[PDB]
Structure formats: C-alpha cells, structure tokens
A paper describes a structure:
Neutralizing antibodies target the hemagglutinin (HA), a trimeric protein containing “stem” (also known as the “stalk”) and “head” domains in each protomer. The head domain includes the Receptor Binding Site (RBS), making this domain the primary target of neutralizing antibodies by blocking virus attachment to host cells. The stem domain contains the fusion peptide, which is targeted by a smaller subset of neutralizing antibodies that prevent membrane fusion. Other designs, such as centralized conserved and computationally optimized broadly reactive antigen ([name]) HA proteins, retain the subtype-specific structural architecture in both domains while seeking to accentuate the conserved features common to circulating strains.
Through structural comparisons with other HA proteins, including novel crystal structures of [name] HAs TJ2 and J4, we identified the residues primarily responsible for the variable binding patterns observed by biolayer interferometry. To investigate the molecular factors that may improve or worsen the recognition of HA by these antibodies, we performed structural comparisons of the NG2-Fab cryo-EM structures with representative HA proteins from the BLI assay panel. This included newly solved crystal structures of TJ2 and J4 as representative strong binders, as well as a previously solved structure of the A/Port Chalmers/1/1973 HA and an AlphaFold3 prediction of the A/Tasmania/503/2020 HA to represent no binding and weak binding, respectively. The [name] HA J4, while lacking this same feature, shows some evidence in the electron density map of an N-linked glycan at residue 144. Given the proximity, this may allow for additional interactions between the HA and the antibody via polar contacts. Even the difference in the absence or presence of an additional hydroxyl group, as seen with F159 in [name] HA TJ2 versus Y159 in [name] HA J4, is enough to alter the kinetics in binding via a faster dissociation rate.
Author numbering:
A (entry chain B): 8 to 326
B (entry chain b): 330 to 500
C (entry chain c), E (entry chain a): 330 to 501
D (entry chain C), F (entry chain A): 8 to 325
C-alpha cells in the first residue's frame, strides 16, 4: 500500500524588483519593466527629421539677413535648433510680435526668398550701416532694403505687388526709428515719414518715433520689423513718405511638421524620432522624465522619475 | 492574493523552477523531482505581453506646440501657456500612476488565477483517488511511478484504473 | 477567464442555449434535455446593464467654447488654442480606450464569476452523491430522472434521499 | 444504468463581435455595443436650440448694418450659423480683435439695437457711399453714423451719454481712414483728426491713417471698427476732432447658452441637443468622431473611429 | 461578488461579531459560541488602508495660476482662459468618478476574496473529516469539544486523529 | 451526537453607507469615507503661508503709492488678498495690460522700492493733485514723480539709469493725458510732449491724447501706467519733451511661491496648507468642491459634490 505526493507551485528569484499596486506601496515581483525614460543619449540625431543648426544665428536673424546668417538663405528644415550662444551683428532691431513671427516661420519650416523688383522711383537703394558688416564692408540685412532720399527729396511711394502664383507670400518689412532729428533729415529729408502696408483684407500703419535709444554696436537708432502675409489673388500695397525698410521679395510659407526648439546639445549622427532639449530620447517607453519640450513621436512627459510595471508574478522567496 | 494561491496555501516560491512559471514537483517511488506546466505559464506571459503591447502602441507624434520655457516675464499670456502645460503634465502623470498601479494589481491577480486554475485542473483530474492537504500538494493513494505523474501533467490520466486501489487505501 | 469557466473546464458554449446565458444539459434514462438558469443570467445582465447606464446616457453641455479651426495663421494665440484642443482630445481619447479595455475585461471576468458560481452552487447541492470530471459535468451515481434533475435546477434536492445508493455506486 | 450526467454550460452565438481588452486586442464576445458616434444626420435641427442662419451675412456685418443683413435687426439666437457664401456689400471695413468682437456678440446671443440721441452739432449726419447700396441709392452701415463737414467746418465734438439702465450697453463705433489727403479735406474740411472714447474706467484713442489701400468697390479708403462696453453708473464720452464714424445708440449684451458655429450644412426640422458643423448628431453614445466643434449636450470628441463595449460573455464556438 | 461568498452562499452577515470582520460560529455538545479570525480581518483592513494611503494625504502644491473669475467680458483671451479651466475640471472630475467606482468594486471583490479564502482554508484543514453544506457552514462528523473548535480556529487541528471516526460517521 | 456545525460568517453594521461602483450605482457597505471636501472654516489662515490683506488697497495701488496704501510699502507676501471693498483716491489712472502687471507683481510677491536720483534738471518735481490728499494736503502717488515745467519752460529730458546690481529691476512710470490743451500748456509749457522709455532690448513710445474724460474726484484727465523691466547689465533711458510721470526708483522683482487671490473672507490665526477664496479648507481628501481658485497644497476641484470610497465590506444585515 504505497502513497505518492504531487505538489504544485510557482517560481521565485533571489531578490527581484519592487512595484506598486492599488493596495500596497511596496510589493516584490519577479520581473518588471521601466515605463519612464529618465535619460538621454546627449546628442540630437540628424535622422529621421531634418535638423538645421543656427549656431551663432537665430531664426529671425536668418530670416532678416544678419551678415553671419547668409548660409541659411533659401534653406528648409524640419526642426530649427537655436543655441544659447547666438547673437546679432547687424542694425539693432525689435519685432513687436517676435514669438508669433518665430512660430510662423518655424511652422512654415522654410526660409525661401524669391526676389521681386519694386518700382522704387526717386529713392536711393541698398542702404548700408557700420553695425551690419558683411564680408568686410558696411552692409544691411540681405533680405531688407534701406531707402534714402535722392537729391535731398524723398518722394511719395505707391507700390503694388499682387500674388498670382497660387501660394501664400510672407513679406518682411521694417520701419526705421532714427535716434536724432538730424539723422531723420539726413536719411529721409522729411520731418516724419508715415508707413502704410495694406492688403485687400488687412492694413498696417506705422508712424516712426525719433529719439535717443541705448546704443548697441554704437547705433542709437532702432528698426521695428513687421510681417505681412498676402494671399493668392491679393495685392500688397505699400504707401509711404519715408522711414521705410522695404521688402526685397517674398518669403514662402508652408504648412508642415516643422517647428523650432532651443537646445545646446550637439547634432550627433544617429536616428531617433524624438528630439528633446536635453538631447534625443528613445520612444520605447510610454512616458518620460527628460523634458516637457518634445518633437516628433515622443513619449509623454510625466513628473514621476520611476514607474515600474511588473512583467512577472509576486516574488515569494524560499527564505 | 485574491485567489490566495501564490501568497496563500502555496506560500513558497521555488527558485529552482527556471524552466517555467508554474509546474509540478513530485515525490514517489523512484524518487523526487520537479517539472513545469507550459500551458498555464504561457497563458500568464500572453496576458502580460498583451498588456505591454497595449502600453506603448502608437506614440503621439506632435511637431509644433506652444512655448514651454520663457526667458523674460510677459504676464497673462505666458501664465496661460504655463498653466496649460502644467495641467497637461499633471493629468498625464496621474494617468501614468493609475495605470501602473491597476495593471500591477491585475498582474498579481492573473498570476494567482493561473495557479488556482492549474490546481483546480489537477484536482479534477485526480478525481477521488487523491486528497488535498492545503498547501498546493496532493496525497495520491495509488502507487504512481515517474510515469503517471506525467499523465497527470499531460492530461492522460484515467482515475478509473487506480480507483479501487486508492479507495481501499483511503478507507 | 480568471476562474477558467468559459474558456476553462467548460471548453465549448452551446448555441442552442437561446432561453438564457447559463444552463443545464442533462442526460439520463429518459433521454436528454437542456434548460436555462435565469438567476445566473440575470445576475450577469443586471451587472453589465448597470455598467451601460454608468456609461450611456451621461452627457455634458458645452455652449460657448474656443475656436477650433482657423483660416489665417496668427501666431502664439492660435497655436495655444490649437494645443489646448489637441491635448483635450488626446486625453479624452486615452480615457475612452482605457474605459473600454477595463470594462471589457471586467465583463469577461464577471461572466466567468457567474458561470463558476453556478458550478459551485450545483456542486455544493450534490454533496457526496456526485463527482466532477473537470469538463463542467457532474457524474450522478444514482439514477436521476427528469424530475430530480429539475430538483437540481429548482434547488429542491435532498441529498439524503439518494446518498446511500450513490455512495455504494461510488466506492464499490 | 445507475448513472446520470448533468453538464453546466453557457450560450454562444454565430454573430460574434470582436472587442478590446487589457490583455488582448482581439477577443470575440456574444453581444457588443458602439460607444463612438461615427455618422451624422448631416443637417442642423431647429429644435431645441434657436438657430439663426446668416446665409450671405456674417455676425459682424449684421451687427454693423450691411444692407443685405438688415433683416437681422432686433433678432436673437441660441446659436448663429455662419456660411461660406457670406460676403460684404458695404464700406470696406476692418475690426481689430475681430475674433474678440465675434465671440462677444455670439456669447451675447442678441442683436438688439435701440437708437440713442447724440447731439452731433455742427456736422452732417447720415453719410453715404457708393458701396453700401441700400434701397437703390447710396447709404452706409445702418448701425453707424458717418459725420462730415457742415458748412465746410468740423467743430470739435464732445458728446456724453450716461448708462442709467441696469443692463450693460455695447457701443460699436469707428474711425475713417481716407485714401488721400484730398479726400480727408473733402470729407472733414480739416487736416486729419483724433477720436477718444472714454468711460469712468476705460479709455481708447484712435488715430486716422491716410494712405492708399487696395480698392474694394472702388474705395481705397478704409474704416476701422472698435467696440466699447459701458456698465450702469458709467458714462460714455466721445471726444472727436474729425474722422469719427459714430454709434447710433447701444446694443444690448447678455450672458447665456448662445454661441456661433461655422458650417455649410442645411437647416432641418428635428430635435437634437448636439449641433456640429457637419450636422446634428445623436447624443446617446458617450463619444463621437464627427467634429471637435460641438454645441449643446454632446458626446465628447475622440480620435478613434470605433470603441466597442462588450455587452456579453466571450464567444467560443461549438 | 465575483466569488459569491458575501452575497452568495453566505447570505447573512452577523452584527454580533464586533471583534473582527470575519469569524466562526460553532455548535457542539458544550453549546454554541462565536469567534473572529483576526488574520483575514487584518489582511482586508491592510488592503483598504493601502488604498487610503495611496489616496488620502497626497496633496499637490500650486501657487500662481491663471485667473478663473472675470468681471468684464474681454473676449478671445477670456474665453480661452475659461475653456482651459473648464476642460481641466471636467477631466479631473471624470478621473475622480472612475477612481471611486473602480476602488469600490475592487474593495467589494477583495472582501469577498478574503471570506472565500477563509472558507477554503477551513475546508482543506478539515479534509475528509467534514462536509460543506453550501451555506458557509461545515458538518463535522465527529465529536468536537470546545477545544476542537479552538483547534480549527487557531490552526492546530489534526484531521488524522478524528479521521476514522469521521469516515465511519460519513459513509456508514 | 457525533455531529458538529462550524459556520463561517462576516460582520455587518446596523446602518451602513451607500457607495457607487462601476457595476452598481448604489450598493451598501459597512464603512465609507468622503473623498470630496465641500466645507470650509470660512477663514483664511496666515500659516504656513504669508498672507497680506489689501483692505481698501488694491495691489496696483499699493505698487503705485496710493496715500491710503502707504502702509504696504517695503512689504512682502506669499499671497495677496484683494477685497471688493477696494477704492483708490489718488488720481484717475489706466494701466494697459492691467491684468498682466497684476500677475507680474503678485508672482513677485514683494514691493521693495529702492530710490534713485535721476537728473530731472530744468523741470519741477513732486507734482501734487487735490484728488491725492495725503496728510490733509494735496499730494501724488508715493512711488511716482510728477514733472512740471520750470521758469515757464520744459527742457528735453534724456536720463540714463544703469543696473549693476545682481538682480532685475522693475520700473513703473506714467504718461499724463490732460483734459484740455490749456492744462497741457499750464503743466508742460508745450503743445505736445512725447515719451520714450527704452532699454537695450525694448522700446516703449507713448504720445499722449489731450481730451476731456469722465471726471473722478473732479479730474477729467488720465495718467496711463506702464512698466519696464531692466535686466542685470542693461540701462533705462527716459527721453521726454513733457507729459512724463517719472519713476522715483526701482521695484525689485523676484520668483517664488507668490500670487494673488480675491476673497472677502477674514484672516484668523490658523494653519492650513490650502487657501481658497471661500476660506482655508483642509487637504485630507484628494478632491474638493468649494472653489476652483486654490493656493498652496490643495485638493483638486471637481464638479461632483460628494464622492464616497468604501472602507469596508458589503453590508447584509439580519
Ligand atoms: C473734445 O471736446 C473739446 C470740447 O468741445 C474740444 O475742445 C475744443 O477744441 C476746439 C479746437 O481745438 C476749440 O475751438 C477753438 O475755439 C476758439 C475760441 O473758443 C472760445 O469761444 C468758444 C465759442 O465760440 C467757446 O466755446 C470757448 O470756450 C472759447 O471761449 C477759436 O478761436 C479757435 O479758432 C481756431 O480754429 C478755427 C478752426 O479752424 C480757425 O478758423 C481759427 O482761425 C483758429 O485757428 C478754435 O475754433 C474749442 O474752444 C475747444 N473747446 C473747449 C476747450 O471747451 C476738443 O477739441 C475735442 N477733441 C479732443 C481730442 O479733445
Ligand atoms: C465734455 O463734455 C463732458 C460732459 O460729460 C464734460 O464733463 C463734465 O464737465 C462738467 C464741468 O464742465 C462737470 O460738472 C462739474 O462736476 C463737478 C464734480 O465735482 C465733484 O467733486 C466735488 C468735490 O471736489 C463735489 O463737490 C461734487 O459734488 C462732485 O462730487 C461739480 O463740482 C461741478 O459743480 C460746480 O461747478 C458748477 C459750474 O460752475 C456749478 O454750477 C456748481 O454749482 C458747482 O459749483 C460741476 O457740476 C461734469 O461732472 C462732467 N461730466 C463728467 C461725466 O465727467 C466735459 O467738461 C466736456 N469737456 C470740454 C467741454 O472740454
Ligand atoms: C529726447 O532727448 C533729446 C536730447 O536731449 C532731444 O533731442 C533734442 O530735441 C530738441 C527739440 O527738437 C532740440 O532742440 C532744438 O534744436 C534746434 C536745433 O539746434 C533749435 O533750433 C531749437 O531751438 C528752439 O528754440 C528756438 C528759440 O525759441 C526756437 O526758435 C526753435 O523753433 C526751437 O523751439 C531747439 O533748441 C535738441 O537740439 C535735440 N537734441 C539733440 C539733437 O541733441 C529730444 O527732443 C528729447 N525728446 C524726444 C521725444 O526725443
Ligand atoms: C502714397 O502715395 C501717394 C502718391 O501716389 C501720396 O500722395 C501724394 O501724391 C502726389 C501725386 O499723386 C504727390 O506729388 C505731389 O504733387 C504736388 C502737385 O499737386 C507737388 O506740388 C508735390 O511736391 C512738389 O512741389 C513741392 C513744392 O514746390 C516740392 O517740395 C516737391 O519737391 C515737388 O517739387 C508732390 O510732387 C505727393 O507728394 C503725395 N503726398 C506726399 C505727402 O508726398 C501719399 O502721400 C502716399 N502715402 C502717404 C501715407 O503719404
Ligand atoms: C542720452 O543720454 C545717453 C546716455 O548714455 C547718451 O548715450 C551715450 O552717448 C554718448 C555720446 O554722447 C556715447 O559715447 C560714445 O560711446 C562709444 C561707445 O563705446 C562705449 O560703449 C561700448 C559698448 O560695448 C564699450 O565697450 C566701450 O568701452 C565704451 O564704454 C565710445 O566709443 C565713444 O568714445 C563715446 O564715449 C555713449 O556710448 C552713449 N551711451 C549709451 C548707453 O547710449 C545719448 O547720446 C543721449 N542722447 C542725446 C543727448 O540725444
Ligand atoms: C464659494 O464662493 C463662490 C463665489 O461666491 C460661490 O459661487 C456661487 O455658487 C452658487 C451655487 O453654484 C451660484 O448660485 C447659482 O448660480 C447659477 C449661475 O447663474 C449665474 O451665471 C449665469 C451665466 O449665464 C448668469 O446669467 C446668472 O445671472 C448668474 O450670474 C444661477 O443660475 C443659480 O440661480 C444660482 O444663483 C452662484 O452664482 C455662485 N456665485 C458666483 C459665481 O459669484 C460658491 O458656491 C462658494 N462655495 C461654497 C460656499 O462652498
Ligand atoms: C496707388 O497704386 C494703386 C495700385 O496700382 C492704385 O489703385 C488703382 O487705382 C485706379 C484709379 O487710379 C483704379 O482704377 C479704377 O478701378 C475701378 C474699379 O475697377 C473702376 O471702376 C474705375 O473706373 C477705375 O478704373 C484701380 O482699380 C486701382 N487698383 C487697385 C488694385 O486698387 C492707386 O490709384 C495708386 N494711387 C493712389 C493715390 O492710391
Ligand atoms: C520729493 O518728494 C520726496 C518724497 O517725499 C522727497 O524725499 C523725501 O525727503 C525727506 C526729507 O525732505 C526724507 O525724510 C527724511 O529723511 C532723512 C534721511 O533719511 C531722515 O533723517 C529724516 O528723519 C526724514 O525721515 C524722505 O525719506 C524722502 N523720501 C524718499 C527719498 O522716498 C524729496 O526730498 C522731494 N524733493 C524735493 C525737491 O522736494
Ligand atoms: C541693390 O542690390 C540689388 C541686388 O540684386 C541690385 O539688383 C540693385 O541694382 C542694387 N541697387 C543699387 C546698386 O542701387
Ligand atoms: C533637461 O534640461 C532642463 C533644463 O533645460 C532641466 O531642468 C531638466 O532637469 C533636464 N532633464 C534631465 C537632465 O533629465
Ligand atoms: C421548477 O421551476 C420551473 C421554473 O423555472 C417550473 O416550470 C417547474 O414547474 C418547477 N418544477 C419543480 C419540480 O419545482
Ligand atoms: C446669397 O448670395 C447668392 C450668390 O452667392 C445668391 O444666389 C442668393 O440669392 C443670396 N441669398 C440671399 C441674398 O438671401
Ligand atoms: C444736447 O441735446 C439736448 C437734447 O434735449 C439739448 O437739449 C441740448 O441743447 C443739446 N446741447 C447742445 C450743445 O446742442
Ligand atoms: C438719419 O437716419 C436716422 C435713422 O433713424 C433718421 O432718424 C434721421 O432723420 C436721418 N437724418 C437725415 C435723413 O438727415
Ligand atoms: C489552539 O487552541 C487551544 C485551545 O485549547 C489553545 O490551547 C492553543 O493555544 C491554540 N493554539 C495556538 C497556537 O494558540
Ligand atoms: C471608518 O473608518 C474611519 C477611518 O478613519 C474610522 O475613523 C471610523 O471609526 C470607521 N467607522 C467604523 C464604523 O468602523
Ligand atoms: C478702509 O476704509 C474704511 C472706510 O471705508 C475705514 O473704516 C477703514 O479704517 C479703512 N482701512 C484701512 C486699512 O485704511
Ligand atoms: C544732467 O545733470 C548734469 C549734472 O548736473 C548736467 O551737467 C547735465 O547738463 C544734465 N543733463 C541735461 C540738463 O540734459
Ligand atoms: C494743508 O492744508 C491746509 C488746509 O486747511 C492748509 O491750510 C495748509 O496750508 C496745507 N499745508 C501746507 C504746508 O500749506
């Protein structure tokens, strides 16, 4: 009369990992995976997204034509990376809605300038300044045109540029605010010069303010930058008497996956579809803790540094 | 612990069970031994793998979003941008936390289920030939070689051939 | 499937089971038969209906909101409005998927509970006059006509009536 | 025999339905229901929400007085529907913060104009142009008064009007920008001007800008529309040296369920809490995939085309 | 009720037990009495306390936020500021509602599980010396003095001492 | 006999609590706890946070130096409380982006004014008004200097102030809009006086509008308040020909746990990590139903009034 015994049981591991459930803060299980990406490789991968590095240039500076940003002319990008070392080496400028312009150009993702010939009759063209030094001579923004008086007479300007090529045009333009009255007569030969740039749907009027300003690159005058968008079938109308920083052409605006990100991480050679200011990160986890700023297919940002999901059963040790 | 098997009556994990998650450890004539159940183990991995597949899945692809870091202080519009991002971050962090807690609890219970299921199947197989002590072990009152243990492990066990012997041994 | 009832010992479902969700299929000397248990069926149906009512019928009212589509590109304000709506849709989309997945798993498991509850009720009813083969069926070791099968289904089973014959048929 | 068999089982159907679980993406259950709305009626319902159709008119144009929009005077709405075919046939206008004014009037839900009595002494009222063609001859925005030189003079205007009523009043006024200096001299007999609209708590000052602009209806000149809100116990003061397009009174503002929706869908006879640009949809399902724009009692918008909820047990065959 | 113990075969709860959540009620030749199982009670209380310690006491600090009450109707910015807060409130309210419903469901299930675990533990402890009546009570087929019930409740019950007597009372 | 009965049972309470599950909307349980706070002590606690009441003084008035607000000078706060019983009696003033500046100063949580000496040569300082009665005598905003002509002449002002301190400076200045041109000539000896405050990264230019406005304290004129932030390593340049309400110094801006809240509730001496406009609430429960505006370690507001969490088993009584 023999007997036998048959026990049923599960496996166990020496130490295991600790997770959290609905009922307990700490519980030991055999295996668990991490759901939060807590690290970055340290560099921004140049694939699969197109990366343009501004280095010493900002997006607006490359848009305007800073003498250190002529290499960004007619350049497209998927993500524009701005460094915390960029500076301006041109005429001091102030864009009243800077963030909106930067977002506009970033979402456009292209800096594509097609030049147009405006009938600037009676005004001296291609103005120059000692703050903007292209090559080794005084210059100005490449995409900007500075008009001064001809024969000490600045005539009225009435220039029309329609849009018939079936794509929206982004026009840059500016208004010069001289630091002295004497400067205003020296360049524009008028007391004060009004500016009116209009389309069939929008109008913009700018009046210049003449007065001293803090000197950057030994220039007390400033220039205000404005942007105008013209639809296909609409005409751009510029009507002025002076203090006009004229467009040299039209910038193209597109609708795409493009944006701009601020970082100081090197553009290393790899492929990662998620870019972060701290560097590119891998999209193998649902969540992440690197940065709240993301581009591409990116894990969602959470405040928690650690979040483990058990890939095994409760670990009951033999001991 | 809801079924009370992994932390319940079977309150012991076998570190020597490197082949599978659940299984059978036997002692009979011809000696003692240890084997694994492959169906219940695979069922547990399949459920966990289904959880993992549902977790990452498709990752949200966002390209141009609001500004989230600011150098100068601007006022209402910047406070609005910060508040929007805070609220989104906190809501997604809460979703993260609840998902981890609930799924981890579900994993604990699914593993306890597969154990109790294997225990129930083995009981139903042994019929009236065996009795349960209450520790995941069955006392079999018929001489079982290292062969009919495999029969119990593989479904090819007939209680009718050991029925009279086990009944006489029991009573 | 946490109890292993629908996909466990009961390997197959019955399509002729049109009078209920859970039922009894008996074979005896008087032939066969198939009957429905309505306590288990309703104890389920009410549970999923209670879910359905928690989900269906609840509705919010939003009258005046932000603009969600735009025609001309503006800048920071338009991007902020787009971002807020995008984050709202994605968060509710996650809530919907997690709702469906959690409730469907509960639906399967609650039906698992109801089937196992029916098996436990019958097993505790039969006491030592029957044994389970692990396929959802019970071996009744005493001759049971349609009347006493209906006594099983109706709850009016006196195990003491047939205990001696079943025990003699079980151990001898 | 001395043996009976009693099996326990569950039901199964051939019309299975695949649903989603936590641990499985494809599981077959007996019965399932749909939680997301995928299709619309396609047309907006007149019930229960009051629907006003602008057809060829925008909300701002009706608020201003474009002649084709003159039928919308004194009208109210629970929801204003703006069509793609909308167009303007009055003076070329521009509204800074146009979206703010549009949302403000929409949340108001009323276009109720009661005319008031400004003195406007020394100027000619009821200016007209060859674009705002009401009746058959020339007119202007019915809600706006155009002031020009009387006896070739434009005396300075300083008018007051108190808010002695317990409802906040909304004033729409404007500034005229002539295309030429010769024009500005012709209309107002003065070289440019100023306008200042003031309350005991708010002040707005506008400057006319003379310059050539793209001609709409042969009009190179523009007018800029602004709004002022005057509350009870306050006084609206208008101080103009010229180029002022004056309000003709006050619009009443309200707070309520009213809004505005952009849609090109027809208007039908039905009752539906949910209104969308794609059309009215039933609100029985908890979610929807029609449009992120909704009005009234509506299911919430989700990005997934279907969300099937299981209403039965797992379906295993025989 | 996924195990069918609280609302099932044990269909009556005892208000007389005040020293524990679960317990035993015995009838023997020495009379009748009541006791409580502190271990299963503690397990259920600990699980509930773990739920509370995950919920109660967790506070989030927010100092400077957007304005949420506006006195003058501004328009676009005011509408947007209203919309974000309304969206946040709705999403958090849904999170709260789903949380309490799920936690209450799991609490009921866990309490049912603790009761079922105690029942199965007692069943496996009694082995073939007793049988289940299907109402949560066990019929012991041998003489139990009050120390016998103590041995079942303390964990020191030896079935092999009463096995022969119980088997004779069972199958004869 | 050789028979014994051992029953296994659970505990029940005489009167339980109804809770809600995903499955049952109403089920009875033994013990339950509330998860939503719907009550308050009706008081604001000055612990652990630093609470500053405003009484009759708004945050902007305290920043500017309203005579009744002089007690708020050189004071800090974690939370600033604004009451509906707030009045200003210095001078009628309008702040472009009033809300932004309010959020600016609130987030700073400090009003630390450090005085500086600008040139102000050729102009008369410490201008006074009869609406700003400080100390039974006509005065002005404490932190703002009113610049008048001297010897019936107003020289052109060009004043530079550098920031060498290792923190940021916040400047508050103003521009005067006289109600009549005779007032403008009387004060500034010039028909029109421009203002231009500039840094190396900003330029703010303002041209005043002369015009009568609704009179508060018999003052038909308005001053427009502007703020300029000068970062460490920048200069503040003031260029004017008249109509200048100049700063008397700089305000120190800081970052921290600081903000502002509106509440007509008392501040007793208690301790609560959570503050709401209805009065400090406890933070034991994870949710609250008192107000959406919260400060500190606060429960999250929800639409629901009461949410119950089961702290016990299902209740079946006998
Ligand atoms: C806001 O509202 C105020 C109040 O109406 C306006 O202020 C008026 O401004 C005008 C023009 O600047 C002033 O008109 C001038 O009046 C002088 C005489 O005024 C006296 O006589 C009148 C009665 O006729 C009295 O009401 C007044 O109080 C004085 O006692 C004239 O001599 C001036 O003539 C000059 O201009 C005309 C017009 O081209 C020429 O023909 C003349 O040759 C000369 O150059 C002038 O007409 C008027 O007095 C002011 N009223 C006041 C101060 O109460 C604001 O202009 C208005 N807008 C703004 C932006 O503030
Ligand atoms: C453009 O048009 C507007 C119309 O709204 C004019 O604004 C009104 O201007 C008049 C004055 O011209 C204002 O009337 C005066 O109001 C004073 C208010 O004073 C307050 O404070 C004092 C104490 O400081 C209190 O005593 C007083 O009760 C008030 O609470 C009154 O004091 C004035 O009354 C005195 O002067 C008049 C005139 O001499 C005497 O008849 C009286 O008896 C008394 O001595 C006077 O009533 C009026 O309030 C202004 N309205 C608004 C809404 O501001 C602009 O002046 C005008 N602009 C021009 C023409 O350029
Ligand atoms: C900001 O600061 C700058 C610097 O102080 C300041 O620029 C100055 O502007 C004034 C006004 O335009 C200039 O002063 C005038 O200069 C001319 C030429 O020298 C003189 O003819 C003027 O004479 C006045 O007085 C005469 C006698 O009554 C009158 O007949 C005559 O019409 C004038 O009224 C007067 O002195 C000054 O030269 C400049 N400073 C320079 C160029 O360095 C500016 O005005 C300030 N404000 C603003 C808003 O910019
Ligand atoms: C937008 O552009 C328009 C022009 O298209 C401009 O309006 C004025 O247009 C006229 C012609 O259409 C410009 O020409 C003037 O014509 C008159 C004759 O009527 C001349 O007298 C003017 O100056 C001459 O004479 C002066 C005195 O002898 C001299 O000082 C001068 O050098 C000339 O010899 C002039 O030729 C006129 O100039 C413009 N207006 C102005 C102010 O220039 C309109 O002004 C433009 N937009 C804006 C916002 O100004
Ligand atoms: C209003 O007041 C302002 C006060 O700052 C005036 O601005 C100053 O104007 C003077 C001329 O009168 C300038 O002086 C020259 O500056 C250049 C620049 O070099 C200096 O700055 C660079 C910056 O990097 C620094 O590296 C150098 O070492 C110098 O310190 C000098 O090269 C000249 O020699 C000369 O000093 C001031 O630079 C200028 N300062 C500012 C901040 O603008 C303004 O002109 C007045 N406006 C009027 C009177 O209308
Ligand atoms: C904390 O303080 C808050 C502010 O004092 C309290 O808010 C109050 O809450 C009560 C109860 O919900 C509100 O009373 C109802 O309000 C509704 C809304 O109507 C208002 O809005 C519509 C918008 O179209 C407008 O048309 C109406 O004229 C109203 O202005 C009314 O329909 C009801 O009849 C009823 O009055 C108060 O309105 C609200 N006060 C506000 C927002 O100022 C809050 O209850 C406090 N919490 C506590 C004490 O626990
Ligand atoms: C400044 O440049 C613009 C653009 O070239 C000029 O606008 C054009 O002005 C002429 C009249 O001088 C307009 O012709 C008229 O058109 C109407 C409508 O078709 C027609 O009914 C008249 O009989 C006349 O032919 C022309 O349409 C207009 N073009 C545009 C695009 O606006 C403007 O005249 C120039 N000068 C000034 C002072 O604005
Ligand atoms: C313009 O008005 C300002 C503000 O009232 C004047 O500054 C103030 O000047 C007085 C003295 O006239 C200062 O009070 C005294 O300060 C000294 C030194 O600390 C102390 O020993 C005395 O006991 C008394 O407290 C007061 O602090 C000062 N306020 C400031 C600088 O904010 C200024 O003098 C006036 N200028 C002219 C030209 O009238
Ligand atoms: C200014 O430069 C452009 C560049 O193409 C040229 O076309 C134009 O003739 C120049 N104008 C001059 C030199 O006056
Ligand atoms: C990423 O960088 C930000 C600052 O740009 C920092 O606050 C954050 O902690 C970093 N996250 C890391 C290193 O994971
Ligand atoms: C059993 O119950 C059924 C209804 O479910 C009834 O039709 C039948 O008559 C009952 N039979 C007995 C024997 O109780
Ligand atoms: C609206 O304009 C269309 C032309 O686009 C016209 O056919 C229709 O009759 C107009 N409806 C009106 C004016 O009610
Ligand atoms: C203003 O209008 C009222 C209307 O009754 C009139 O009595 C008064 O004389 C008018 N004032 C002027 C200055 O025309
Ligand atoms: C201007 O139109 C209004 C409209 O009600 C009218 O009362 C007034 O008499 C008109 N003025 C004229 C025609 O001069
Ligand atoms: C078992 O019950 C008996 C009752 O006589 C008691 O003496 C003993 O202490 C109990 N066991 C334990 C471990 O306490
Ligand atoms: C319910 O639980 C709370 C937890 O704080 C406790 O204070 C209360 O006494 C309990 N009620 C009962 C009846 O046990
Ligand atoms: C506020 O004003 C009231 C009178 O309106 C006065 O009684 C009270 O003392 C004032 N409080 C302060 C702090 O000035
Ligand atoms: C500023 O003050 C200095 C010293 O008093 C003086 O020499 C200079 O002329 C002043 N600047 C002016 C008046 O613009
Ligand atoms: C302050 O006002 C009183 C009013 O009675 C006046 O007499 C006194 O002169 C004023 N103070 C000074 C310093 O003049």
């Amino acid at each position: 009369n023999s007997t036998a015994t048959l026990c049923l049981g599960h496996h166990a591991v020496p130490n295991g990992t600790i997770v959290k459930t609905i009922t307990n803060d700490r519980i030991e299980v055999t295996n668990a995976t991490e759901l939060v990406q807590n690290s970055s490789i340290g560099e921004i991968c140049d694939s699969p997204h197109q990366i343009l590095d501004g280095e010493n240039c900002t997006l607006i500076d490359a848009l305007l034509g800073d003498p250190q940003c002529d290499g960004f002319q007619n350049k497209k990008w998927d993500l524009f990376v701005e460094r915390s070392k960029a500076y301006s080496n041109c005429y001091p400028y102030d864009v009243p809605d800077y963030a909106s312009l930067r977002s506009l150009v970033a979402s456009s993702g292209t800096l594509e300038f097609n030049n147009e010939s405006f009938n600037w009759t009676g005004v001296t063209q291609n103005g120059t300044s000692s703050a903007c030094i292209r090559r080794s001579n005084s210059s100005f923004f490449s995409r900007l045109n500075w008009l001064t008086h001809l024969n000490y007479k600045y005539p009225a300007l009435n220039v029309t540029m329609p849009n018939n090529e079936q794509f929206d045009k982004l026009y840059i333009w500016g208004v010069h605010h001289p630091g002295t009255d004497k400067d205003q007569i020296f360049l524009y030969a008028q007391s004060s010069g009004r500016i009116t740039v209009s389309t069939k749907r929008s109008q913009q009027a700018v009046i210049p303010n003449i007065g001293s300003r803090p000197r950057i690159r030994d220039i007390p005058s400033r220039i205000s930058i404005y942007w105008t968008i013209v639809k296909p079938g609409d005409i751009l109308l510029i009507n002025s008497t002076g203090n006009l920083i004229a467009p040299r052409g039209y910038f193209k605006i597109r609708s795409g996956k493009s944006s701009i990100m601020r970082s100081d991480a090197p553009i290393g050679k790899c492929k990662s579809e998620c870019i972060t200011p701290n560097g590119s990160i891998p999209n193998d986890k649902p969540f992440q803790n690197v940065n709240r700023i993301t581009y591409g297919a990116c894990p969602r940002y959470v405040k928690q540094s650690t979040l483990k999901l058990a890939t095994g059963m409760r670990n009951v040790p033999e001991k | 612990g809801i079924f009370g098997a992994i932390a319940g009556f079977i309150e012991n994990g076998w570190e020597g069970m490197v082949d599978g998650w659940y299984g059978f450890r036997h002692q009979n004539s011809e000696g003692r031994g240890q084997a694994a159940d492959l169906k219940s183990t695979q069922a547990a991995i399949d459920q966990i793998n289904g959880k993992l597949n549902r977790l990452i899945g498709k990752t949200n692809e966002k390209f141009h979003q609001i500004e989230k870091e600011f150098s100068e202080v601007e006022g209402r519009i910047q406070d609005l941008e910060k508040y929007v991002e805070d609220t989104k971050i906190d809501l997604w962090s809460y979703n993260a936390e609840l998902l981890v807690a609930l799924e981890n609890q579900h994993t604990i219970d699914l593993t306890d289920s597969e154990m109790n299921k294997l225990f129930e199947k083995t009981k139903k197989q042994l019929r009236e030939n065996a009795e349960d002590m209450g520790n995941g072990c069955f006392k079999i009152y018929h001489k079982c070689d290292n062969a009919c243990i495999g029969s119990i492990r593989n479904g090819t066990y007939d209680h009718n051939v050991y029925r009279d012997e086990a009944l006489n041994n029991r009573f």
